[PDB]
Amino acid sequence: SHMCDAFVGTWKLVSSENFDDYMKEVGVGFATRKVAGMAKPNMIISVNGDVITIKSESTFKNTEISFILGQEFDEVTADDRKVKSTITLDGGVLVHVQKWDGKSTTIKRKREDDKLVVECVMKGVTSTRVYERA
Ligand SMILES: Cc1cccc(OC[C@@H]2CCCC[C@@H]2C(=O)O)c1
Numbered sequence: 001s002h003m004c005d006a007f008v009g010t011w012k013l014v015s016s017e018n019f020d021d022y023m024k025e026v027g028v029g030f031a032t033r034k035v036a037g038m039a040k041p042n043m044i045i046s047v048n049g050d051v052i053t054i055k056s057e058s059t060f061k062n063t064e065i066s067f068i069l070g071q072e073f074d075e076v077t078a079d080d081r082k083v084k085s086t087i088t089l090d091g092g093v094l095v096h097v098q099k100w101d102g103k104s105t106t107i108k109r110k111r112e113d114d115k116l117v118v119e120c121v122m123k124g125v126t127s128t129r130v131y132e133r134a
Helices: 019-026 030-038
Strands: 009-017 042-048 051-057 063-067 073-076 082-090 093-100 103-112 115-122 125-133
Touching: 019 030, 019 115, 019 125, 063 073, 063 082
Parallel strands: none
Antiparallel strands: 009 042, 009 125, 042 051, 051 063, 073 082, 082 093, 093 103, 103 115, 115 125
16 A cells, blocks of 8 residues: 555546636636536546556546656646646645746645545635545
8 A cells, every 4th residue: 555545546526616716817718717617527546656647537628647756747737738747745635736838836636534625726816626436
């Protein structure tokens, strides 16, 4: 057993707060905000050795990242940004920093009760997205 065991599984979005404002702060345009905001993604987290994979599937877009903690990688976001990402574990929380165009956003994923809580921060704006087991 290991690092991210409590994250592994298949998860479905059950609540979202302030996501439109988070996307505005990120720079996402009107039509993508509207369509992306409707999506109820399933997130599938798995671990194989040192490699963590996070897949997201939705009506809007499917995304997939595989990574080693602390090791920067290239990512294509659901809103089609091309970012440089680094994900670490800090006190049991996955901390994901995305850098692009001189900008930065941080996404934290943590286990809380039977939920997986995702907090997305861009400058002063946070969005909270809560997932339950599928
Ligand atoms: C695949 C897809 C479709 C539409 C929205 C979306 O948001 C992802 C959220 C923001 C970016 C960080 C992760 C968040 C999460 O809910 O895991 C993803």
